[PDB]
Curated annotation (Swiss-Prot), chain A:
Protein name: Pre-mRNA-splicing factor PRP11
Disulfide bonds: none
Other comments on record: Present with 3460 molecules/cell in log phase SD medium.
Shown residues within the full chain: 155 to 253 of 266
Family per record: Belongs to the SF3A2 family.
UniProtKB/Swiss-Prot annotation, chain B:
Residues of the full protein shown: 90 to 192 of 280
SURP motif repeats: 6-46
Extra remark: Present with 2490 molecules/cell in log phase SD medium.
Name this polypeptide is given: Pre-mRNA-splicing factor PRP21
Locations listed in the record: Nucleus
Classification of source organism: Eukaryota, Fungi, Dikarya, Ascomycota, Saccharomycotina
Listed GO CC annotations: catalytic step 2 spliceosome; nucleus; Prp19 complex; spliceosomal complex; U2 snRNP; U2-type prespliceosome
The organism's place on the tree of life at top rank: Eukaryota
Keywords attached to this entry: mRNA processing, mRNA splicing, Nucleus, Repeat, Spliceosome
Subunit relationships: Belongs to the CWC complex (or CEF1-associated complex), a spliceosome sub-complex reminiscent of a late-stage spliceosome composed of the U2, U5 and U6 snRNAs and at least BUD13, BUD31, BRR2, CDC40, CEF1, CLF1, CUS1, CWC2, CWC15, CWC21, CWC22, CWC23, CWC24, CWC25, CWC27, ECM2, HSH155, IST3, ISY1, LEA1, MSL1, NTC20, PRP8, PRP9, PRP11, PRP19, PRP21, PRP22, PRP45, PRP46, SLU7, SMB1, SMD1, SMD2, SMD3, SMX2, SMX3, SNT309, SNU114, SPP2, SYF1, SYF2, RSE1 and YJU2.
Major location (coarse): nucleus
GO biological process: mRNA cis splicing, via spliceosome; mRNA splicing, via spliceosome; U2-type prespliceosome assembly
Role, per record: mRNA splicing factors, PRP9, PRP11, and PRP21, are necessary for binding of the U2 snRNP to the pre-mRNA in an early step of spliceosome assembly.
Molecular function via GO: RNA binding
Curated annotation (Swiss-Prot), chain C:
Protein name: Pre-mRNA-splicing factor PRP9
Full-sequence portion shown in this chain: 1 to 159 of 530
Major site of localization recorded for this protein: nucleus
Quaternary structure (record): Belongs to the CWC complex (or CEF1-associated complex), a spliceosome sub-complex reminiscent of a late-stage spliceosome composed of the U2, U5 and U6 snRNAs and at least BUD13, BUD31, BRR2, CDC40, CEF1, CLF1, CUS1, CWC2, CWC15, CWC21, CWC22, CWC23, CWC24, CWC25, CWC27, ECM2, HSH155, IST3, ISY1, LEA1, MSL1, NTC20, PRP8, PRP9, PRP11, PRP19, PRP21, PRP22, PRP45, PRP46, SLU7, SMB1, SMD1, SMD2, SMD3, SMX2, SMX3, SNT309, SNU114, SPP2, SYF1, SYF2, RSE1 and YJU2.
GO cellular component, one term: U2 snRNP
Further remark: Present with 3920 molecules/cell in log phase SD medium.
RNA-binding found in the keyword field: no
Family: Belongs to the SF3A3 family.
Domain of life: Eukaryota
GO molecular function list: RNA binding; zinc ion binding
Gene Ontology terms: biological process: mRNA 5'-splice site recognition; mRNA splicing, via spliceosome; U2-type prespliceosome assembly
Keywords from the UniProt entry: Metal-binding, mRNA processing, mRNA splicing, Nucleus, Repeat, Spliceosome, Zinc, Zinc-finger
Functional note: mRNA splicing factors, PRP9, PRP11, and PRP21, are necessary for binding of the U2 snRNP to the pre-mRNA in an early step of spliceosome assembly.
Localization in the cell: Nucleus
UniProtKB/Swiss-Prot annotation, chain D:
Location within or outside the cell: Nucleus
Highest rank taxon of the organism: Eukaryota
Protein name per UniProt: Pre-mRNA-splicing factor PRP9
Family recorded in the similarity comment: Belongs to the SF3A3 family.
Function, as annotated: mRNA splicing factors, PRP9, PRP11, and PRP21, are necessary for binding of the U2 snRNP to the pre-mRNA in an early step of spliceosome assembly.
Length: 99, 103, 145, 53
């Protein structure tokens, strides 16, 4: 996934090093819990950034790209194995890639 | 190779006069030398190359007569200068912490 | 060929080598210490470090792990060939040391525009060509490429 | 500095002896510079030669 962000349009009013250094974050959420609680049974690859609104992507397949020791076990947990393992944050251009 | 070559060439000329490039920019009008502005990232590396060339102009007409002993002494002193500042590489887990909090 | 570029590359390589043998002298100060001590008894003038430094195997504040003889000697011979390279480059360098032409060359630089290739191998291949552990996949042989 | 000169194992004009001494000397020297790569070999050589002359 290739998520694009603002082009210095509104981020010009907020620059007080308040988690500004924090990159977008992804998490896998089960639909078992929703504001409406109607239907459920699949996962979502949620992606979040402070100002912008959350985003989700349905994952019917039980498992895809779930690799096996890709790198050589280096321990900077960041947030979780998922984020360090397979995400890139082009902060200079504001492009978040996830795979 | 192209970018490298143009950077290093405009750097070669820019190292002697600094007037030939400021004229070239107004004469041609090409998005090729867009690295001349400090905006373009590569610009920085440019500032390096030129400096380096500027340096070659320093001792032109002078030979370097460093001996083995001396070279060794120098390298030993350079290693001591790198060991002088060893209390500055212990600040990075902080950002991670922030991330964990927000997540 | 613009001599400026050649002399530049030379000074740069010399810098690279100095940095390499300096990194070495850093990880295991013995490399220098050992050497220097012997030198002391051949050329009496030579100034040698504080004994404490020698013993604790430290250069400033950090005391480094003691290495075995075979490795110390190895790295010393490696540094030997490095210094040989350096002496050679220094030599050749000693022996080596407008607008219309600017546009003239910039024009020929347009040659072969379709050269799709990533070029990150000038300072990296050198830096790498002279660094610790340059032989194995990751960390098996201390010897540089 | 004097013993090897005034209390020689053998007569210093003996052939076998001088040959031996040659081989041994060569060995010791190569060993020396072999065990101390980092020191400028040429410097040492010239120093010794000038002391000799």
């Amino acid at each position: 996934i290739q998520v694009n962000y603002s082009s210095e349009v509104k981020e010009n009013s907020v620059d007080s090093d308040d988690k500004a250094k924090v990159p977008p974050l992804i998490r896998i959420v089960s639909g078992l819990e929703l504001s409406d609680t109607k239907q459920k049974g699949k996962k979502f690859l949620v992606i979040a950034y402070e100002p912008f609104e959350n985003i989700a992507i349905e994952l019917p397949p039980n498992e895809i790209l779930f690799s096996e020791n890709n790198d050589m076990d280096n321990n900077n947990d960041g947030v979780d194995e998922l984020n360090k393992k397979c995400t890139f944050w082009d902060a200079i251009s504001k492009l978040y890639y996830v795979q | 190779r192209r970018d490298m070559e143009v950077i290093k060439l405009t750097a070669r000329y820019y190292a002697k006069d600094k007037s030939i490039v400021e004229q070239m920019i107004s004469k041609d009008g090409e998005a090729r030398l867009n690295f001349m502005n400090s905006s373009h990232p590569l610009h920085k590396t440019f500032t390096d190359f030129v400096a380096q060339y500027k340096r070659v102009y320093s001792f032109t007409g002078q030979e370097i007569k460093k001996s083995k002993r001396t070279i060794l002494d120098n390298c030993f002193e350079r290693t001591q200068y790198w060991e002088f500042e060893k209390d500055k590489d212990r600040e990075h887990d902080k950002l991670v912490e922030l991330c964990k909090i927000q997540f | 060929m613009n001599l400026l570029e050649t002399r530049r590359s030379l000074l740069e390589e010399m810098e690279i080598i100095e940095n390499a043998i300096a990194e070495r002298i850093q990880r295991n100060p013995e490399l220098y210490y050992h050497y220097i001590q012997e030198s002391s008894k051949v050329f009496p003038d030579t100034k040698l470090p504080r004994s404490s430094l020698i013993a604790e195997n430290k250069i400033y504040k950090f005391k480094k792990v003691k290495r075995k003889r075979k490795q110390i000697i190895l790295q010393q011979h490696e540094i030997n060939i490095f210094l040989r390279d350096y002496q050679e480059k220094q030599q050749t360098f000693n022996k080596i040391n407008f607008e219309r032409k600017l546009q003239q060359l910039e024009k020929e630089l347009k040659n072969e525009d379709e050269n799709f290739e990533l070029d990150i191998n000038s300072k990296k291949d050198k830096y790498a060509l002279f660094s610790s552990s340059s032989d194995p996949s990751r960390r098996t042989n201390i010897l540089s490429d | 500095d004097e013993k090897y000169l005034l209390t020689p194992p053998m007569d210093r004009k003996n052939d076998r002896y001088m040959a031996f001494l040659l081989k041994l000397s060569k060995y010791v020297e190569t060993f020396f510079f072999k065990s101390y790569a980092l020191l400028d070999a040429a410097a040492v050589e010239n120093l010794i030669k000038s002391d000799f002359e």
